Amino acid sequence: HPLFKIINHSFIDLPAPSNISSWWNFGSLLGVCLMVQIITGLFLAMHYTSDTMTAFSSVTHICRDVNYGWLIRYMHANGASMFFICLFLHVGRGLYYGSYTFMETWNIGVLLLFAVMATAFMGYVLPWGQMSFWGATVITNLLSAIPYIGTTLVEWIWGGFSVDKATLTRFFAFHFILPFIIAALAIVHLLFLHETGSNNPTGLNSDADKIPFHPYYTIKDILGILIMFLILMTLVLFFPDMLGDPDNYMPANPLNTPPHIKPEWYFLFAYAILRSIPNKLGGVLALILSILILALMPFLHTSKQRSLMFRPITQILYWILVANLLILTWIGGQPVEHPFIIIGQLASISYFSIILILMPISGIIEDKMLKLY
Amino acid sequence: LSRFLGPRYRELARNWIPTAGMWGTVGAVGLVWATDWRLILDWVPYING
């Protein structure tokens, strides 16, 4: 049957490696999170109004008067946080196990990552709190950095001299429409992966040992979905605000700036980099490269072994990379003052030098140790 | 339909009947439960409330 054929080839019988660990669950979790977000987003859209007079009032009306509306709203917010947790672990799996040699899958991935970051940014602007308004102005201002056409572009997006209702409404439209483009790009993602099949943690050709997916990696994905739902509901029902900003519960006052302005936990690494570079433009570029350096990653693989299971020096460099990514996440939070700044500057220098320079040199050294080079 | 007016066809159905009823039963119970239909659930002693 031409509709069922797809599933049989893709979901029911696809030959999958028998030895893939729990990390390979995470991408499926991302898809589930996407649906969850879409579903919760749809049930936020039946009561949200994208008017600057009524946006905060509509959000409070959702939390206070709609039956279980607080549940759907905090599920949406903590599901965005869970989406970025699963996204970061998915990207870390791709970096560690050499999955970036699937170059088309990797490039569709980094496009999906850019789209998800833009969607989450405009979604965080949407409740029109104090923190949303000052956050929007800030990043929209980021664009002004552009050398020649910057001012125009910023004003275009804002739709006026400064973010105001003009922005909110177009940000509602764009935040509505981009997750469906993300779903289509995810179909292209899984598509370009079906042409190749998944990788295994040993990094070897797993053609001799492949098993079906229906009874082996389906119940595994169901168990991972159950664990992710446990973490999401203990994030929603017990510590709902632990992943938020108290200043977003104040209305947007264009006159005042919340003093402790900071991007959400997931944008921090980038925030740190931006702050680190003295030049505004430099910051914007580095920021972009921060995400883009990944796309650049499949051209930096200089080893004869795909995975890092048998590569201890590059394992050490990888965990140092995870370490200073956590450091950059912390610095972003810290305010502008000594010595947070220097760490930020170094941490960014170390991040770009480990990804660009240290890992291919280490792979060359590791090939020399096995009498291969 | 000509082919379906058959002797074995009938036998097959008769053999299939019990299973079919079971499935309807599951759905009926399901609908009652999913909808929290109280008209029906009010009959059940424990389920009441």
């Binding site: 009306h61 008067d65 709609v66 039956n67 279980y68 759907i72 | -």
Partner: protein
Amino acid sequence: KGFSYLVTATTTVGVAYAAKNVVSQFVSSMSASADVLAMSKIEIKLSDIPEGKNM
């Protein structure tokens, strides 16, 4: 078999119970919110209307 399947049957009810609950709240969300539900006691002045008139 009865031990292994009973676990499948047990799990199902549990999931089934959660699935009805999740779907139930969602379904319920679209139902009237508290604001509207709290509508009653309209006051009408008889003097307002004279015979042969509707208001």
